[PDB]
Design a protein around this ligand. Structure first.
Ligand SMILES: *C(=O)[C@]1([C@@H](O)[C@@H]2C=CCCC2)NC(=O)[C@@H]2CCO[C@@]21C
Ligand SMILES: *C(=O)[C@]1([C@@H](O)[C@@H]2C=CCCC2)NC(=O)[C@@H]2CCO[C@@]21C
Ligand SMILES: *C(=O)[C@]1([C@@H](O)[C@@H]2C=CCCC2)NC(=O)[C@@H]2CCO[C@@]21C
Lengths: 191, 205, 204, 208, 203, 230, 212, 204, 191
């Protein structure tokens, strides 16, 4: 039930994730990077058990690199999104990966995909996995404008994360936000 | 897991040479968490009667207060202190009146007979199935540990010093093998003349 | 348990086994499953032993209550006994797993009522109940005649309860016979040595 | 683990000349006395009898396994049978294998035999695979309805052990629902296996 | 159980209780909850005792195999990754491994929290076990980066001691290990009974 | 537990082991399972020790009040009916599997009362965990009109069979022989003789014990205070 | 269906400077019934160690057979009898091989190492290994453990040196503890098998205990 | 279901009921519960209908397999049929709730093996199985004689299966008789009109 | 599983409680005063369902006022603590109040009582109900000194609450701390 929130802009994607890793009632770390950079172009925020998320992230990143090396071409964001969807569809039926993801990738066009452990793939302008969607979707609906600037995008993502902090009972102690744009995945701070 | 295991307890009573010794762990634990090291499980019921309640702290206090209500009423209405056997039957009645919603405490009555001054141990289960061991009466989550150590260690005719010696050592051995019990011990040596309340050192882990 | 009460022309033959079973253990091997409710009214008991004994004692209480305000104490007593057995079973159907065949003699003559564990009371000329009665249902149907006298019915009931004792693990021991006529009730015990059949009937 | 068609109690006890095993010849279907004159013991070797209390289907499957293995080792050894210790060890390992496969043979299996050295061997393997060798073994209610009637006379004279087993099986017939019929007695002695005449061990019925 | 490990300027201090207890009974108070893996790497044992001991000695076997196969020794990240992959392959088998892979490699000090569940979290301060919350409280309240070796070892020792006091699952003796570039150093096993201050009347 | 009461020619012999277990551990090694009901009636009980003790005390009080108000000797079937009704009204939750053994005008009577209230008059009865090991002896050695000593030995041997064969039973064999003070006089006073530790199996005693008790635990006393006992 | 019989019975091991004294009750029993009054549970694995298993007897026999098989394989493939420490590691790995179908047996591996020093190793059913000066396993483990703690004080003070208890004194301690357990644990009883591993080899003694 | 195979001096009489029951509904009222495994080997089937029919077809396969390498096809065939029934039941005890009485004639003569639902195979002179066999256990014990011929045993089996049909709800319909002698197997159907007894035997 | 923490000093008691009330995954309020001032001298921090805590607090406060008005004397801290214990002991067996409390009272002497829904009453120098005890007890053990000053007491309570915030997965969005001293119960801010 970890809070990962994606926000797609005209030429960027702000992908944020709960940075607090936990063991039972203990917050083991306050800066755990739950967003997985499968490629230099794609950051996969993952909500789920830390072990399942780590193993799935490593598998997907290894497969993306293997596709890049086997064939001298990098996966697209639609191709990678559907590869993740195929992986999750295989898993659910046999040996399920219990991870709900937001795949944010920039391959010349911004892309944000709502993915879940079952394998529902949907390109979204904004979304979230965990209970944070119940808190952030409305704010996006209330404040997202087409053609949103990157600064307005950071403001809107900050608003969504602040809503997670304020209204979600299990408030993440912090978030790690990453900007996925033509320059790649860069970790940022929203203040 | 279990309601009795919620509050770790370890109460022991031993019979000596015209003297008894009731010891108890001093820990108020909540399952695996130590809340306090100053929890009183042994209570003076009469000048020559001490009651150690090994079990749920809730029921330790409830049973202690209910038996202080019964003993005070008996001593007021009879102008006489309650006998160790009379108090044993009183505790048996108190527990069996709640037989089907039992107090989760095993009582251990360490007393001296009013005239002969002989040791009187009386340990029951949650519902007053009192035993009257001439040697040692154990109770609490350390029940197996206390039984084992006291079976080998207890010897007949222990003077107050020797009786304290095993009560303390044997209780220490029991509590140090019980995770939810320990954090200090208290041993009441009841004799003809005096009650010696020695706070003994057990492991605090 | 094997219960077999036969309403004869000249009396009632209540045959029973004597085996109380706790699983595969027989706590009582000489059980009196037919309880003397009244000198000429008996209750053969099957199902839970505690429930059936409570039923017998409660029916003794109910039949004495029937006599609080009346002087014809031997009138409709068997029918009332069956009715109270049935009302206690239906009233306590959740807690009482008891079936009772109440048979005897009263002003109305010989009677045999089979109250089932469900609480269904039926006046029966031939009534059987218990686990062992199943094994002897066909035997009874082949060997029971309406015209049997109390002695003929006693012999047939001994034979049937002996067959049930042989084929049922829950049924065993001695055949407790009660013969209730107008004069009174005669108890008999048919021990395994005096039983007409043995385990040897199995496989010929 | 489920018992349906069950063989009744078995009481085996070593006496001076060998091992005396008693058990009814009745298989019970639940509580019903279903089959009579069905020996609960199977002579797997001239000096090795094997009985079992509990599901008799699992004891027929175990006897099939035992007979197959004895036949294998007999063909290998040109007629020589497995010893009672070897047969019981195979039963212990096969019943533990069945338990480990989660398909246990729901029968407590007594192996009573004379080893070639002449030492009486009486051992038991429970459905779970726990085996133990003892001078006297009761299985089923023969274990429970026993007391000191066997232990006091075990390794004694044949008459004393026979009387003790007869007392135990009188208790069994009296207080076991599945106890039906004659109680067969089998003597496994170094001179072979002798099926003594089955005996009706009547409970004292003057109780009524 | 209570195991802790923290990276300060001078190295990695790993302090562990020694109590194995199931239910109420204390099966042992001398359990070694630090299993060496490499000359400058150890793995802590928390949760299931058999699981942690088998998988940490298996990880030691794999580290030795890698060092002999390839001259470069297996790093602390690589070792923790091996362990976490092996443990994740047994997800759903009710394994219970809580284990901090604390080692000094070519990239410096590294603590990786490894669990049966497959979580592999890098960090500079971890505590695993029933009483790990108490050790965490003592650490996070008294931890400094510039503590001397003695100060850091005493911090870990006192955190384990307070965990043993407040947790029934923790007890025995604090095995303190100092891991530096040079290699694993086993500081001492200090009986928490001696660490308790009986002049205090509050606990 | 192993409790067994049989009826001999002159009376009743009840017997019980003296081992109470708090699970797999022997809490008591001198447990009293033979409960005085009235001068003529003793109940030996199994099941829950508290339930047995309390129900036996309650029925003993009921029959003492009966004998006081009415001047009548309590009847064994009367005690058994009271016990069975009480156990039935508690639907078996009072786990007191009792064996009533007494002598009234109807002679020596032994009744079983199951925890659920099912009673039964039987010549010899064995209840408890070792009830089967005991009943075997009772099945093989009980006969109509046996003398007092043979029934005593049989009931003690049945309790010993339960003791040895059953883990829940052990320690000593306490007997209680209800008998008429003058056996030839059927109207004579019904007295009882309780043989505590009638059998003390020597092979079941503590056979070893460290004469110098080795102990390396040292007691450190935080605080000592002495208070008068008055 | 639970594939274990949860057999009771206590084994008390005490490691010495040059001896190991494991005393286990012979009795095999579960559910108020004694399957075997005598059923040895301490086995001489080789000339270096002995294994004492308490718990499900099917699993005791299976694990002891597996350990004998592995020690014979080690003697054949590594040309010497497996040492007590090697046997201890092998016991840990053998028990853990069934981590998901555990042998429900608690193991005491007591032996004499190449140094001549006593080596006792305690185990749980799933294969936790622990080099111990003393241990108690089985139904009366909770009973017997305080006895050993009092005899040695190791639990009371973990870091103090283990007292230099003589071989005969350790044998007496194990006997007394087993007798106390027999008095209190119903499952413990019948005969005590007191095995001692020393430089002189494996010695065995049979002491009666209360049958009841 | 009522199964009753009698090994006579001159053949085997396999009597069965014809009632397949799905609870209180009778999907098949004229069931052939005795399956012709071989011309002189038949399998009376009780328990799960699907499991017993699979057992019958698998035993046909197993007995044909027995004949792959041998020419004495009528030798030990009934014993092998019982053994394969028993090995399939024990092998599939979790999934097959099937009891089978396999009876017939082969080189060894007339034989009747009762393999129980547990998978216990016993060569029986008189074998019965199914819910209805319980009601007629005592009847069989009282009326079965080892010396009965195939005609006497046929009449007795018709009577017993008719009694079971009457007293058992799970057993009903017609009495499927199979008479296997050396010459072959003769099937007969005793319809309710031709059955010796009726429901009227109940209560006299 | 709400975090209430009590800390008894030489002449004061700092009683803090989770100030975040919640409905399911929603933090309804961020300043809910979970500490109940049964008397002017006694503040009862309560951890449990908001409804159970409110009803029990109102019952206890009404009973304390009724004792003060019926008899012209106010309940002591031991007397009030045992009255609460009696109430909880009654409740557990019949109609249980599922509230774990810390009763902090000053009646001329500071008092802090660890009370639970079952009815275990224990005077404590410091304690906590909820999972916060697993995080704060050690810090108290590590940093509590007899004769602690009120400023040192506030520092120690702040340390404990900071440990709750940092290490407890469900970190309370804030705490309400109340000082119970000779001047009564005064709400304070620990910064
Ligand atoms: C018989 O119904 C039976 C006996 O206990 C019987 C009960 C009523 C009269 C006293 C004895 N009840 C049972 O629970 C078993 C199982 C079937 O038959 C029993 C033996
Ligand atoms: C006997 O049944 C037993 C004893 O505690 C017994 C109880 C009634 C009379 C007092 C002593 N009850 C038990 O719970 C244990 C289990 C085995 O039998 C016991 C020893
Ligand atoms: C009989 O066994 C029965 C029939 O369906 C029967 C099965 C085997 C042969 C074909 C028809 N099986 C059942 O499940 C019901 C309940 C008892 O008897 C049945 C009618």
């Amino acid at each position: 039930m970890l809070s990962i929130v994606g926000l797609q802009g005209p030429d960027w994607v702000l992908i944020a994730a709960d940075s607090s890793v936990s063991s039972s009632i203990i917050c083991m770390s306050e800066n755990y990077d739950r967003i997985a950079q499968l490629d230099d172009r794609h950051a996969l925020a993952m909500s789920g058990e830390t072990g399942d998320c780590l193993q799935l992230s490593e598998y997907l990143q290894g497969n993306v690199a293997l596709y890049k090396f086997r064939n001298g071409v990098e996966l697209s964001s639609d191709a990678l999104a559907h590869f993740i969807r195929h992986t999750m569809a295989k898993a659910v039926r046999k040996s399920p990966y219990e991870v709900n993801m937001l795949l944010s990738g920039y391959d010349g066009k911004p892309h944000l995909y709502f993915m879940d452990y079952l394998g529902t793939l949907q390109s979204i302008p904004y979304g979230a996995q965990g209970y944070c969607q119940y808190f952030v979707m409305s704010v996006f609906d209330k404040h997202y404008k087409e053609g949103l600037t990157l600064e307005d995008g950071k403001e809107l993502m900050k608003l969504a994360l602040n809503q997670i902090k304020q209204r979600f009972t299990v408030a993440p102690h912090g978030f790690i936000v990453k900007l996925v744009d033509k320059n790649g995945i860069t970790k940022i701070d929203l203040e | 897991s279990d309601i009795s295991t919620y509050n770790g307890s370890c109460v022991l009573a031993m019979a000596g040479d015209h003297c008894v010794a009731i010891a108890s762990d001093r820990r108020l634990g909540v399952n695996m968490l130590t809340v306090s090291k100053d929890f009183k499980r042994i209570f003076q019921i009469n000048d020559r009667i001490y009651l150690g309640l090994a079990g749920l702290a809730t029921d330790v206090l409830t049973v202690r207060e209910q038996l202080r209500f019964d003993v005070n009423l008996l001593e007021l209405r009879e102008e006489r202190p309650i006998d160790p056997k009379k108090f044993m039957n009183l505790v048996k009645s108190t527990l069996y009146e709640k037989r089907f919603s039992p107090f989760f405490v095993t009582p251990v009555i360490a007393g001296l007979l009013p005239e002969t001054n002989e040791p009187y141990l009386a340990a029951s289960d949650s519902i007053g199935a009192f035993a009257f061991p001439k040697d040692f009466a154990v109770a609490g989550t350390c029940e197996e540990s206390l039984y084992g150590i006291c079976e080998s260690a207890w010897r007949p005719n222990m003077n107050p010093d020797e009786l304290f010696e095993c009560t303390a050592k044997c209780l220490i051995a029991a509590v140090e093998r019980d995770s939810i019990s320990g954090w200090g011990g208290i041993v009441y040596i009841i004799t003809q003349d005096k009650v010696i309340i020695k706070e003994i050192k057990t492991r605090m882990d | 348990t094997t219960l077999l009460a036969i309403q004869c022309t000249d009396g009632v033959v209540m045959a029973s086994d004597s085996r109380t079973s706790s699983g595969s253990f027989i706590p009582n091997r000489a059980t009196n499953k037919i309880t003397e409710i009244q000198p000429k009214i008996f209750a053969a008991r099957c199902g839970n032993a505690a429930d059936t004994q409570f039923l017998a004692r409660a029916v003794k209480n109910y039949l004495n209550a029937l006599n609080i305000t009346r002087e014809n104490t031997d009138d409709s007593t068997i029918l009332v006994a069956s009715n109270v057995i049935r009302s206690l079973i239906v009233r306590y159907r959740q807690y009482l797993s008891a079936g009772v065949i109440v048979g005897g003699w009263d002003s109305a003559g010989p009677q045999v009522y089979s109250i089932e564990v469900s609480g269904m009371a039926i006046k029966k000329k031939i009534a059987s109940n218990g686990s062992g009665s199943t094994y002897i249902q066909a035997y009874i149907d082949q060997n029971y005649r309406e015209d049997m006298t109390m002695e003929e019915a006693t012999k047939f009931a001994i034979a049937a309860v002996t067959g049930a004792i042989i084929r049922d693990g829950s049924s065993g021991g001695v055949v407790n016979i009660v013969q209730i006529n107008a004069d009174g009730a005669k108890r008999m015990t048919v021990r395994p040595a005096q039983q007409p059949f043995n385990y040897d009937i199995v496989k010929g | 683990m489920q018992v349906i068609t069950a063989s009744g109690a078995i009481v085996a006890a070593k006496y001076d000349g060998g091992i005396l095993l008693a058990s009814d010849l009745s298989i019970t279907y639940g509580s019903m006395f279903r089959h009579n004159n069905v020996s609960h013991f199977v002579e797997v070797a001239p000096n090795i009898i094997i009985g079992a209390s509990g599901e008799f289907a699992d004891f027929q499957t175990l006897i099939e396994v035992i007979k197959s293995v004895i036949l294998q080792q007999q063909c290998k050894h040109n007629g020589e049978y497995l010893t009672a210790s070897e047969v019981h060890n195979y039963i212990k390992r096969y019943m533990y294998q069945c338990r480990s496969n989660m398909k246990p043979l729901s029968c407590k299996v007594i192996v009573a035999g004379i080893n070639p050295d002449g030492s009486k061997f009486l051992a038991c393997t429970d459905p779970y695979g726990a085996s133990w060798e003892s001078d006297h073994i009761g299985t089923g209610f023969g274990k429970y309805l026993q007391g000191l009637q066997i232990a006091d006379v075990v390794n004694g004279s044949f008459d004393d052990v026979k009387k003790g087993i007869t007392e135990v099986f009188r208790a069994v017939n009296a207080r076991n629902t599945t106890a039906n019929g004659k109680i067969e007695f089998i003597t496994v002695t170094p001179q072979g296996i002798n099926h003594l005449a089955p005996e009706q061990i009547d409970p004292n019925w003057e109780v009524v | 159980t209570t195991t802790l490990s923290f990276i300060y300027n001078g190295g990695i201090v790993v302090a562990v209780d020694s109590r194995a207890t199931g239910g109420q009974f204390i099966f042992s108070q001398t359990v070694m909850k630090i299993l060496p893996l490499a000359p400058n790497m150890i793995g802590t044992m928390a949760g299931g005792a058999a699981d942690c001991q088998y998988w940490l000695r298996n990880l030691s076997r794999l580290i030795q195999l890698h060092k002999f196969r390839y001259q470069q020794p297996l790093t602390v990240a690589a070792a923790s990754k091996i362990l976490v992959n092996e443990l994740y392959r047994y997800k759903g088998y009710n394994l219970s491994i809580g284990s901090m892979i604390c080692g000094y490699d070519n990239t410096g000090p590294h603590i990786f929290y490894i669990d049966n569940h497959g979580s592999r979290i890098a960090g500079k301060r971890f505590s695993v076990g029933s009483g790990s919350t108490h050790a965490y409280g003592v650490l996070d309240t008294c931890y400094r980066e510039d503590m001397t070796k003695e100060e850091a070892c005493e911090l870990g020792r006192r955190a384990i001691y307070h965990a043993t006091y407040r947790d029934s699952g923790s007890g025995g003796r604090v095995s303190v290990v100092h891991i530096t570039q040079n290699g694993v150093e086993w500081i001492d096993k200090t009986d928490v009974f001696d660490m308790h201050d009986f002049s205090k009347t509050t606990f | 537990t192993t409790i067994a009461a049989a009826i001999f020619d002159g009376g009743v012999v009840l017997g019980a082991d003296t081992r109470a277990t708090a699970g797999p551990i022997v809490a008591v090694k001198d447990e009293m399972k033979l409960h005085y009901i009235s001068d003529n009636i003793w109940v030996c009980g199994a099941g829950i020790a508290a339930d047995n003790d309390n129900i036996n005390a309650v029925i003993s009080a009921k029959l003492r009040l009966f004998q006081m108000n009415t001047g009548l000797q309590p009847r064994v079937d009367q005690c058994t009916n009271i016990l069975a009704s009480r156990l039935f009204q508690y639907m078996g939750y009072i786990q007191a599997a009792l064996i009533v053994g007494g002598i009234d005008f109807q002679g020596p009577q032994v009744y079983q009362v199951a925890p659920h209230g099912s009673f039964s008059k039987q010549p010899f009865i064995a209840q408890g965990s070792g009830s089967l090991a005991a009943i075997s002896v009772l099945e093989n050695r009980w006969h109509n009109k046996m003398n007092e000593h043979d029934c005593m030995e049989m009931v003690a041997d049945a309790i010993y069979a339960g003791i040895t064969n059953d883990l829940g039973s052990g320690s000593h064999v306490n007997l209680c022989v209800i008998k008429r003070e003058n056996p030839e006089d059927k109207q004579s006073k019904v007295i009882y003789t309780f043989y505590k530790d009638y059998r003390v199996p020597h092979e079941n005693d503590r056979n070893f014990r460290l004469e110098p008790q080795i102990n390396n635990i040292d007691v450190e006393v935080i605080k000592t205070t002495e208070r008068p006992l008055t | 269906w639970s594939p274990y019989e949860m057999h009771g019975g206590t084994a008390i091991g005490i490691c010495g400077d040059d001896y190991v004294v494991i005393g286990a009750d012979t009795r095999l029993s579960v559910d108020y019934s004694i399957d075997s009054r005598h059923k040895a549970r301490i086995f001489k694995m080789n000339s270096n160690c002995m294994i004492s298993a308490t718990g499900f007897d099917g699993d005791i026999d299976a694990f002891i057979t597996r350990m004998r098989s592995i020690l014979l394989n080690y003697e054949n493939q590594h040309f010497h009898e497996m040492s007590v420490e090697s046997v201890a590691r092998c016991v840990s790995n053998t028990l853990y091989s069934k981590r998901f179908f555990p042998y429900y047996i608690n193991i005491l591996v007591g032996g004499i190492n190449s140094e001549g020093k006593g080596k006792l190793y305690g185990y749980d059913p799933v294969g936790t290994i622990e080099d111990l000066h003393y241990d108690s396993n089985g139904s009366g483990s909770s009973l017997a453990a305080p006895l050993l703690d009092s005899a040695f004080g190791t639990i009371h003070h973990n870091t103090r040196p283990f007292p230099a208890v003589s071989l005969q004194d350790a044998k007496n301690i194990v006997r007394d503890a087993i007798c106390s357990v027999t008095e209190r644990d119903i499952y413990t009883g019948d005969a005590l098998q007191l095995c001692v591993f020393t430089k002189d080899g494996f010695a065995q003694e049979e002491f009666p205990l209360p049958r009841h």
